[PDB]
Amino acid sequence: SGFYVDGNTLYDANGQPFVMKGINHGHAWYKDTASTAIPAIAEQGANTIRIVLSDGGQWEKDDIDTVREVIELAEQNKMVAVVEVHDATGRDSRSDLDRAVDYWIEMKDALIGKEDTVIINIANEWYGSWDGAAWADGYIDVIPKLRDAGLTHTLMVDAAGWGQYPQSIHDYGQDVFNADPLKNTIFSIHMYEYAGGDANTVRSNIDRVIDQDLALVIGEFGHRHTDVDEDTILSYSEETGTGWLAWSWKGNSAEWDYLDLSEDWAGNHLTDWGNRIVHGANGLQETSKPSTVF
Template identity: 40%
Template sequence: MTAAGNTGYESWGDDTRSAITRMRAAGVANTLTADAPNWGQDWSFTMRDGAKEVFAADPDKNTVFSIHMYGVYDAKREVSDYINRFTEAKLPLVVGEFGDRYSDGDPDEDAIMVTTRSLGVGYLGWPRSGNGSGVECLDLVTGFDAGRLTPWGERLFNGPDDIKETAEEAGVFKGTGHGGSGARTTG
């Protein structure tokens, strides 16, 4: 695949369809994630407008699309329009990265969290810890210590529409006691 940053993104659809076809032909059966071009932010709407054709290229219909919502998504209208286009088309989407601040603008994290919740779309706050180069504001915890939430981590885990309020245990782990094998014992 070619790079799909801010140059070369025009080939994202062809490259992604080709990659899906090759992986399925090689026997890869798990869920595939197609990350958006433009360093994940899809400011060109290449993924948004081409997702239907990419999804159709997967014979297993087991591809999910991932958008990174940073400075490009600084208003509720932009957030809801983007996510709604996928849900209305019945295409699987996850907000694969977002934060409450970023070097290229101030994403509307409240709109991201409420919109994903209302439409049944998943999200991942980004990242746990260890950023540098001016984006340390994205760290959820200080020094990789889960007991030391940053302001962004506090918002993501303990604010409105947060992880604590919206998370559900995956069905594969229910009733196992510690998650993992899914095996149950009776006695």
């Protein structure tokens, strides 16, 4: 029993549509914060946490005990865990995707049996270039190896272009889905200045996926700062049943710290951005519903 996909809808194990409303947590870079940050994220009303893991490619590898620990903390706070490997971010090289795939297979014992509470986002932002065909071949090759390893989880696949070239999913997403004998794969767009730059763009990018009867989550998105239209991401996602996961709880480097949702790991002092996501129109408190498996 696990999550299932039918067209552009993701269903929990009780067959109830599940629309992710949640938050990215940079676990890989802040491993000891788990027992503070994960429950703090739950306290905000998030029904899903996207957990940044490392396969040791660029940062400190998250071992199998750590994977178990963080998924357990999510589950025991009534949140779905979207686990993701972050080390292939922006890279076109197949080798980086290979490393992520091998990581999931290495960690399969922490994952098997958790199909109703864990969704596997194969690699964050793999394939930085805007090339639908090449992006597709990567996942056409990758998905069967995961299935062969006995991983039956819903798989989440990031669009090419660091998640910001959703044309890739429109043009090749069905080919990628077809490569999954389980027919249980969904797609993610990351919406920043390009893919989420204005209302029209947000709507067009969501439409170009779900109108292909492919399931979609906005696995990361941002906000306007010194343009990203978080209002439309929030409202149009709600209208269409499209899930989203805001980036990110805490710990961005100085260059991106405008993206921190919370001043503190415990979430007692949200930033303006955190307040918008948690307490604002179409945000977590207003629209997030827990997976019915809980």
